[PDB]
Amino acid sequence: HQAISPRTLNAWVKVVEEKAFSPEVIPMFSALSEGATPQDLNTMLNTVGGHQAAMQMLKETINEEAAEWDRVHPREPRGSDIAGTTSTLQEQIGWMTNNPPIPVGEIYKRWIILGLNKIVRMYSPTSILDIRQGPKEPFRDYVDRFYKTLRAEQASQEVKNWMTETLLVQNANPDCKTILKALGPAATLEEMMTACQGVGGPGHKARVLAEAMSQVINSA
Amino acid sequence: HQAISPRTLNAWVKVVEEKAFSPEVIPMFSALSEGATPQDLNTMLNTVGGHQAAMQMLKETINEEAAEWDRVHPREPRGSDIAGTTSTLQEQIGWMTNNPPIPVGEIYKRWIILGLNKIVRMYSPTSILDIRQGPKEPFRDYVDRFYKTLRAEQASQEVKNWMTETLLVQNANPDCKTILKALGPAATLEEMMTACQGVGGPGHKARVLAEAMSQVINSA
Amino acid sequence: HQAISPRTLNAWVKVVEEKAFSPEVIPMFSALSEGATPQDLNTMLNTVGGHQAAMQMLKETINEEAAEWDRVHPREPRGSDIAGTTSTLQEQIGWMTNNPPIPVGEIYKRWIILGLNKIVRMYSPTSILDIRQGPKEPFRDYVDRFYKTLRAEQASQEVKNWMTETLLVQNANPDCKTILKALGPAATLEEMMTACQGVGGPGHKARVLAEAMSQVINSA
Amino acid sequence: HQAISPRTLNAWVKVVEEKAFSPEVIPMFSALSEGATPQDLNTMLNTVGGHQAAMQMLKETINEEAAEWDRVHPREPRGSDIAGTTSTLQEQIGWMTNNPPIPVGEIYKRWIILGLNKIVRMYSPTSILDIRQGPKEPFRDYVDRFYKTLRAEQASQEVKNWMTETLLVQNANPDCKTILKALGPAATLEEMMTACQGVGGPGHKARVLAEAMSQVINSA
Amino acid sequence: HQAISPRTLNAWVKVVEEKAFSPEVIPMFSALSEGATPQDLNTMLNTVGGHQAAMQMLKETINEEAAEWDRVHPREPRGSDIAGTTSTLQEQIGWMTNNPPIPVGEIYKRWIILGLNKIVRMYSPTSILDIRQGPKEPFRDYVDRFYKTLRAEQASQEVKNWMTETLLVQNANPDCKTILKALGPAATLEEMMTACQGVGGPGHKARVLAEAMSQVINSA
Ligand SMILES: C=C(C)[C@@H]1CC[C@]2(C(=O)O)CC[C@]3(C)[C@H](CC[C@@H]4[C@@]5(C)CC[C@H](OC(=O)CC(C)(C)C(=O)O)C(C)(C)[C@@H]5CC[C@]43C)[C@@H]12
């Protein structure tokens, strides 16, 4: 048999990790899995890195599809057999080669396509550019979330360092941003966190309130 | 057979604690665990202390690889048998030294290497130096977290006391920092907490607002 | 036979592309591919996407090692047979399971390790951060190089758009930088290229020389 | 045998010409060639007009895929047999209709999809809108490049004349653009080339430098 | 038979690496390889790392000597047999132990000595001390050449870093040297490259010409 070659599987993983879950991944999946066995489709789906929530919804949709097949359809393959959960590779090969054919691979591909369509319909891909500090969020938690996303980000080490240099100070709230810009660019992460530790405390609130009242009093 | 030695295990634990989960763990592990029965691998993994979340991820990854082996591969070892959970030492050695050999230890090493690579990729070590105080965080909760982290980390007692003296006051927000500096160095922990209890309350906030207003009025 | 797994190969590709050719590539290759046939090693080598020059030198190093093996060593494996070029999986499996065994996979792995060590020794990765306009380079050639590198760069589309927004004007030469800065942030790529189309022509050089001489005369 | 109809082939050529090597050609290629004999796939690939570099890229990718097939897989078809080079239509039809079937057409389609995906990943189309004069390029070579691109462009004669009237003067460098604008709309191509013959010569540089210094002196 | 020991081969490699291709290479090669078979001589020749051009000339000289031997002379050894390309170790041992002996190793050593003498005659080794920036060379190209030579240079990492901080700015052209000196020792490679990116452009030319003319006018 001609299963999924490593090149095809790696191209699938690359296209998924490059285009996230955009609609354009739906055609690519169908093209790279023509004639694929249900076990081959399961291997195709199981090698996706990240996107745990999307894979969870895809598995849930596959489960609903299998339940629907079990309800409508009373050896004869079942929903789990088509999905490959309880089915040997030899059984699938026999099913797709027996006369008359039972395209278990085609049915599984249809179910996976339905799940992919739903995901693409309501997905929302996170990114390092979408990590910004809240109006009242502490700077330490902002740095924690930013670095977690950066570690989850897909880029080279130098590009990640450039992201750290730029977006960390770019995407902070004005209260922390004014303090951060009041410091020199040479300031490292520890100094920035120490400077922004005070933001939100009673002392910082009193200081900003006093500055505002002094400015408005001097204006009038 | 020749199983793992106490010095081998001690060196493994020592490097794990020293480098936490630095990438150098990946080679060094493969410099000790090679040629070992998967039971020795399980002992190697379980002997470690701390990093419970990382060990949970590592176990989860081995579970995923065992499920993958059970799916692709239909006595012949199963995924749990290779993982060592449901395989005894005798049949384990028999599998290792069979004709043809079934490298159960090699496959378990590959799974553990995959899990360690994931951990190295997305895990950030926690240290006492990273424990600071939030802008609204009460001082008592800060001290509790500080002491919990201090007890968690390994060091000699003299270094622990030096850290307590030099870091607890230093890694505090300006509101607590001002009160702490206004107190004498001879002040103990109970005195420090008592003097810092009022921070964040109504009286302290009113007092700081009063100083800010007085400074503004005196300036102009 | 238990050949390589899709997850292991995916992880190998992931580490190769994430770390480029950092030294950390050598241990991981020694962990994922340890115990594999020469065909599996060839698959892992050929599957790696990008870095055409580095894979070329790896092929040259493997060829040199095979030639040395042929020169020293007079069915008995040859250099090409060990490298997998002129051998089948059945022949290799028989070789590593013969009495006495002939570790063809081990020798091929050693050759690949030597090649990877040489690459890590003298290979310098390229990145979009290293694309800077020359002092005499036309702006359009710089833009073409920048966009080619961006297309070759491993990043998400949003990150690539951010790179286009920032680095393209950030890495331009001062003569083009002045014009781009005077253009304003709202300028598009076509307008930016039109504005810098004359940098280096007789008119621009005459203008800048006249400005410099006017500054000198006004100073005097 | 139901081969590829002329309408399907011409539609494939039309979408390739109109959409270029945009992503939307992967879905279209799969839809029009679903069930195609490898000879039919080669006919679709060869009929594409233009895009010599991209077609060569696809040929190299198909060659690498055939080499991979030959390496992994020991009448039994070979890589060139799947690619359709060393195989007749009768042999491929018999392979498709054999028991068990050998989907050589599906494998060739997968290889072509892989090559198309790589091309779409890194291809960049060229158009007459991208033909601009360099800051030091002589006007005549710019006109030659512009007319070569215009001849290679797919458009009507009147549209091509309109772009000749507009873009040729629009996309010239500032030094030539000033002269062309001062010439007049009535000026033909020969007069335009004659007026821009001196751009870059000693006389033109002396003239522009003199004008710049005269402006500077008059300003002072 | 007593072949060449690893210590002798390592000493030969160290001598070549530390003396480059000084005349003292000839005596040491005559002392370490005295009595070696052509296979051992080929091992020492091919093992030498670096100096690709020198080894190419040595191979060319060996080929010329082999051609001369084939022309002058009518199993009976041949030129390639003396060079070890065609002959095996058993044949070489038989020739050296035949009555009368045929010292093919001695002839091959003479050919290698002739090649080494030619190399020592006309070979000039490159060093990081000879990497100087051209009068019109861009700074980034000079940096690339310097770093490639440094990577090829035999030294420790700390010494290489010291070379980076000293020679890179020490061996820059005066136009770039002035800007680098005006920057300061605190500047890193990125800031230095950004500052020197404008050297050799209309703005920099206008600036330096204006400075010189202002100096002349002030002097007058
Ligand atoms: C301010 C002054 C004190 C004096 C008072 C008035 C003045 C005079 O009466 O003397 C009018 C003439 C000028 C403006 C000088 C200043 C200097 C200049 C200059 C020397 C400037 C540098 C320029 O050099 C290049 O452009 C050379 C190169 C780049 C290689 C190229 O060929 O393009 C050239 C073109 C050679 C000019 C010639 C015109 C003069 C003499 C003025």
Numbering used by the authors:
A (entry chain C), B (entry chain B), C (entry chain A), D (entry chain D), E (entry chain P): 12 to 85, 97 to 242
Paper text:
Despite the high resolution, the density for BVM is an average of 6 symmetrically placed molecules since the Gag_CA-SP1_ lattice is six-fold symmetric (C6 symmetry) while the BVM bound at the symmetry center is not. To better interpret the averaged density, we modeled six symmetrically related BVM molecules inside the cryo-EM density (**[Fig fig4], left**), which was then compared with a surface contour generated from the symmetrically placed BVM molecules. This led to accurate positioning of the BVM model consistent with the “up-orientation,” where the dimethyl-succinate group is oriented up towards the CA_CTD_. In this binding mode, the betulinic acid moiety of BVM is positioned to interact with residues ranging from I231 of CACTD to T8 of SP1 in NL-MA/NC VLPs (**[Fig fig4]**) or L231 to I8 in T8I VLPs (**[Fig fig4]**). Another distinct difference observed in the *in situ* structures is the altered shape of the density for IP6 upon BVM binding. The succinyl moiety of BVM may compete with the phosphate groups of IP6 for interaction with K227, resulting in an altered binding pose of IP6.
The Gag polyprotein, composed of MA, CA, SP1, NC, SP2, and P6 domains, is the sole viral component needed for the assembly and release of an immature virus particle, which is accomplished by the oligomerization of Gag into a lattice structure at the plasma membrane. Cryo-electron tomography (cryo-ET) data has revealed that the immature Gag lattice forms a spherical cage of interconnected hexamers where the CA protein plays a critical role in stabilizing the spherical hexameric lattice before the viral protease cleaves the Gag polyprotein into its individual subunits and maturation occurs. By contrast, the immature CA hexamer is stabilized by both CTD-CTD and NTD-NTD interactions and adopts a more extended conformation with a six-helix bundle at the base of the CA-SP1 domains, and the immature lattice is stabilized by NTD-NTD interactions that mediate the inter-hexamer contacts. The immature HIV-1 Gag lattice is also known to interact with inositol hexakisphosphate (IP6) at the K158 and K227 rings within the central pore of a CA hexamer.
